[PDB]
Write an enzyme that holds these catalytic residues in place. Structure first.
Site, mmCIF file in Angstrom:
data_model
loop_
_atom_site.group_PDB
_atom_site.id
_atom_site.type_symbol
_atom_site.label_atom_id
_atom_site.label_comp_id
_atom_site.label_asym_id
_atom_site.label_seq_id
_atom_site.Cartn_x
_atom_site.Cartn_y
_atom_site.Cartn_z
ATOM 1 N N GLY A 67 -4.149 -40.606 9.508
ATOM 2 C CA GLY A 67 -5.059 -39.894 10.390
ATOM 3 C C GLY A 67 -6.107 -39.109 9.634
ATOM 4 C CB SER A 96 -3.839 -42.992 3.610
ATOM 5 O OG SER A 96 -4.158 -42.862 4.983
ATOM 6 C CG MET A 97 -3.933 -38.901 6.188
ATOM 7 S SD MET A 97 -4.761 -38.145 4.770
ATOM 8 C CE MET A 97 -3.837 -36.625 4.581
ATOM 9 C CG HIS A 121 -6.163 -46.211 3.030
ATOM 10 N ND1 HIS A 121 -7.048 -45.184 3.275
ATOM 11 C CD2 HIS A 121 -5.366 -46.287 4.122
ATOM 12 C CE1 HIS A 121 -6.786 -44.650 4.454
ATOM 13 N NE2 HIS A 121 -5.771 -45.302 4.989
ATOM 14 C CG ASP A 170 -6.088 -50.800 2.768
ATOM 15 O OD1 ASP A 170 -7.014 -50.142 2.251
ATOM 16 O OD2 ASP A 170 -5.904 -50.860 4.002
#
Ligand SMILES: Nc1ncnc2c1ncn2[C@@H]1O[C@H](COP(=O)(O)OP(=O)(O)OP(=O)(O)O)[C@@H](O)[C@H]1O
Ligand SMILES: Nc1ncnc2c1ncn2[C@@H]1O[C@H](COP(=O)(O)OP(=O)(O)OP(=O)(O)O)[C@@H](O)[C@H]1O
Ligand SMILES: [Mg+2]
Lengths: 192, 350, 351, 192
Positions: A67, A96-97, A121, A170
């Site tokens: 997000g 990612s987060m 990513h 990614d």
């Protein structure tokens, strides 16, 4: 609908939702797209548990597709600030987060399930307007990319150059691969 | 008459680690007799009475201070226990007999008797309790506190004449209780809870708030010092009784260093006791300086004060003592830091 | 001469099986008590101090048995008391001073022998408080009894009637110092295991990082009791002052299946020998197979009554046999098999 | 609207929702499209029951048309991690994820109603972007397909090769056919 459970104590029977009952046991659920409102809720839970018992360790179950970056930093800063060690567990997946928060957990207490899927990513953003404004926002996001990579290298232990190369595109890491990369420490296969 | 320094010096020889408490007792007792020497109060103002309340944790030397104080003072010293005391007219005991006991020590001399001191141990035990349907009546409680309170206010107490004949003969020797020092000492277990509930600020939740971990939450030391009359009333003590005891001597849990001195400095120390025991069997016992530190650390965890020390020694020496008599040619036994931890066995010299 | 701890332990081993730690503590205490009596404190400046023992242990573990066996070899006067009967001063129930009166009887009004004596107080856990709080209402049989024992354990003169307690001015109560009277308080502190588990075991949550044992891998009562500390007793209900008076703490272990098997034949007064003598006087011989004894141990363990459980199994197995055995004739021997314990086969008889 | 039912206890009468009342009896309801949100709810319910009694067996009714793979793996890993045996039951139907979770139940405790319809298919996915990114994402779904087929062979007992051939296209299996395949152990026709 959220199911309700009954907790039995000397004071008497008490009724809690399935999420609040787990919160009593120092368990915080991080689910779905990260955003400002959900992040503030997690921040309030971390602070509340800190007051109750600043010595015990908190647990964070991360199952999210990622997000907003700004919202995630509020959670990361809160975890490192408070004295209690935050144990991060990956269920289902961690983008990612979710991965940045997963690896940000206390050294030695980061866990992941065997069939989990981790993806990391670089930050993505966009701006529409004058060229002058574009240069400003373009420079800002680059700072975030370098800043995020610098923090990932610290927790994972990988070199900053290595993180930059892998995060350029990614990259999907399984639970065993994550252990080698340094995102997590061990896998919770079965109850011992 | 005795100077406070002299009183403190005498107590220091037998009491260790209670310098603050000893100061209050020496000053209080000195002021009491000083007032007795003078008459008429030397002015209209009334010189407040000196009544000490020896509140302290278990094994903190409360009884030791009172017992050792009697040796220094030639005045008669009597020791009573609130547990035995009961309301008048019951099989348990009568409060008035305390005065008679003081006379026996002083040979029934009313003059010197008034200059005596009293030490009521286990005073907290008679704390007021709620009514019980099963029990017929609460003989022990506020009723006993009223009798003791009467003596502090000052009232003549009739005493039989050295166990007179069946006929009473109406001797009723009178002795005023206004000048008789009434020391009451008890370990108020559970008082820390009420005191903490009143002085606890609480832990905040925000970023800038101050979080209080359980490690530095609180301790018996620095908590009883803030005792007030209102908290004592909740325990069960009568408010009038507390007001009559203005002087308050609060003891603190012995520290590691203080416990180390007690192990060897006193003549009747625990280490010397076992040394004599082993000597009776033909072996000499030696304790290393490092071993004392570990024993004091273990004793502090027990929270039983000085009595905890005996537990550690008995446990460490349980195995050797069982086999030492059956063993032969062993002339010396040594204990070190490793033995206290339990990983190593007591060293034996042959 | 002075008996050594090993000799004293040998006597206890004959009657008690598996409680090695309790025997060592008891033997050492008697050895020190004898030595103090042999050489009084007046001999040197040093004033030797006593150490009281607290015999913690489950039911049927041999706590009461050790006291009875100890009296067999104790030349010093010894007596056993019951904490339930004791009550605080001023109540019709009883008084703590009565304990000294019982001990004085054994010494034949000998104050010197009574002062240097040993006392045992069974069921000491019964007078324990319900919670860490002192009380809500006066407790005649509870902390109040513990409050009166403090002076008795540490040492205080005890008033008791000299002989008959009548015709004497003021009753001529004898004053006997209890400073040298060793006190052994043995009790079965039921529920103490969970208290210790609260601090010993942590992390009992719901998440993955929590600790779940399923009641099978959990520590047993014997293991938990061995980790007992004074702070744990505070929550159970024991007064802090009372615990200080009892520095030595002895923890008995739960009787295992192997230990129970030994108790059936090894001790001098065994369950099998008791029933065997019952048959010997009636003209019958009772034989127990080795496998049968093992089966009885397993069934007894489930009962949770310790050694007493063994009696229940034997009574039921021999219920039918004892009922019809006297009516039978030409009965000279009987044999018990493993199947008999299960109940599948009737015990063999020799005609 | 969920109805409310009264439960009679020694302490007194208490009001419970129909779903919470069954949760007290170790019954978890899996319904609708699988997703991260409902999955975290089931995970919390599973962990809660484990703490109450880790010895008693849990029940998981499965009536769903399938959904996200990652959310399902969180449930699968949780069922295998905890000690209690999870008894899966198939009501109405069980699609790819519903079937994978159904067969994941404890051996000998997997059931299905007589008229239930089971269906198994390979994962579905897609990605839009550069060719380099397509290759990365394409390799993951292949690993997921191979990983999911490996687990199915372990529970069902069928060979890996057979699972690949049968799962290449949508395959519908009736309740009796599923028993032979190995997805389930028995059928609940009537209460005995
Ligand atoms: N301050 C001290 N210095 C030396 N010895 C001490 C001290 N406090 C306690 N002791 C030792 O503890 C034993 C008993 O202590 P004491 O009876 O004075 O404790 P207490 O304050 O009465 O505790 P409680 O009131 O709970 O019974 C004595 O034999 C003494 O050797
Ligand atoms: N260690 C043991 N060895 C042999 N027999 C034992 C042992 N422990 C208990 N018994 C048997 O149990 C009977 C009674 O045991 P005892 O009264 O000593 O248990 P207890 O510890 O007093 O139980 P409680 O704590 O409930 O009072 C005795 O007759 C004895 O034969
Ligand atoms: Mg008993």
């Amino acid at each position: 609908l959220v199911p309700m459970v009954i907790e039995q104590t000397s004071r008497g029977e008490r009724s809690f939702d399935i999420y609040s009952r787990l919160l009593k046991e120092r368990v915080i659920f991080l689910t779905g797209q990260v955003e400002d409102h959900m992040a503030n809720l997690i921040v309030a839970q971390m602070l509340f548990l800190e007051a109750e018992n600043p010595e015990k360790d908190i647990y964070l179950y991360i199952n999210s597709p990622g997000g907003v970056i700004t919202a995630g930093m509020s959670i990361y800063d809160t975890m490192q600030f408070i004295k209690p060690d935050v144990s991060t567990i990956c269920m289902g997946q961690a983008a990612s987060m979710g991965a940045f928060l997963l690896t940000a957990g206390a050294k030695g207490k980061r866990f992941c399930l065997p069939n989990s899927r981790v993806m990391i990513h670089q930050p993505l953003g966009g701006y529409q307007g004058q060229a002058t404004d574009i240069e400003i926002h373009a420079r800002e996001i680059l700072k975030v990319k370098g800043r995020m990579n610098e923090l990932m290298a610290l927790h994972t232990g990988q070199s900053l150059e290595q993180i930059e190369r892998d995060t350029e595109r990614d990259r999907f890491l399984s639970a065993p691969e994550a252990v080698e990369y340094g995102l997590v420490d061990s896998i919770l296969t079965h109850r011992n | 008459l005795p100077t406070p320094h002299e009183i403190r010096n005498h107590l220091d020889d037998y009491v260790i680690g209670q310098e603050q408490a000893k100061k209050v007792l020496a000053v209080a007792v000195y002021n009491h007799y000083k007032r007795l020497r003078n008459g008429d109060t030397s002015n209209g103002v009334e010189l407040g009475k000196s009544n000490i309340l020896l509140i302290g944790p278990t094994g903190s030397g409360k009884t030791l201070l009172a017992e050792t104080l009697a040796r220094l003072l030639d005045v008669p010293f009597t020791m009573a226990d609130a547990t035995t005391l009961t309301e008048a007219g019951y099989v348990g005991e009568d409060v008035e007999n305390i005065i008679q006991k003081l006379l026996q020590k002083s040979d029934y001399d009313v003059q010197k008797a008034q200059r005596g001191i009293v030490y009521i141990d286990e005073i907290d035990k008679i704390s007021r309790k709620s009514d019980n349907p099963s029990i017929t009546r609460d003989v022990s409680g506020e009723g006993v506190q009223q009798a003791l309170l009467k003596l502090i206010e000052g009232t003549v107490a009739a005493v039989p004449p050295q166990g007179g004949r069946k006929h009473p003969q109406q001797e009723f020797l009178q002795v005023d209780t206004s000048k008789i020092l009434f020391i009451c000492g008890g370990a108020f277990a559970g008082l820390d809870k009420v005191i903490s509930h009143r002085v606890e600020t609480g832990s905040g939740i925000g970023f800038g708030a101050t979080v209080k971990a359980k490690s530095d939450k609180a301790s018996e030391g620095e908590l009883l010092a803030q005792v007030e009359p209102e908290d004592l009333i909740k325990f069960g003590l009568i408010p009038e009784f507390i007001g009559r005891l203005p002087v308050v001597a609060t003891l603190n849990e012995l520290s590691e260093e203080a416990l180390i001195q007690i192990l060897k400095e006193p003549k009747n120390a625990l280490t010397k006791q076992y040394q004599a025991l082993f000597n009776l069997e033909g072996v000499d016992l030696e304790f290393r300086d490092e071993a004392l530190d570990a024993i004091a650390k273990k004793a502090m965890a027990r929270k039983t004060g000085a009595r905890g020390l005996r537990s550690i020694v008995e446990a460490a020496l349980l195995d050797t003592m069982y086999d030492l008599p059956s063993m032969e040619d062993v002339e010396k036994v040594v204990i070190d830091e490793s033995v206290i931890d339990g990983q190593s066995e007591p060293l034996l010299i042959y």
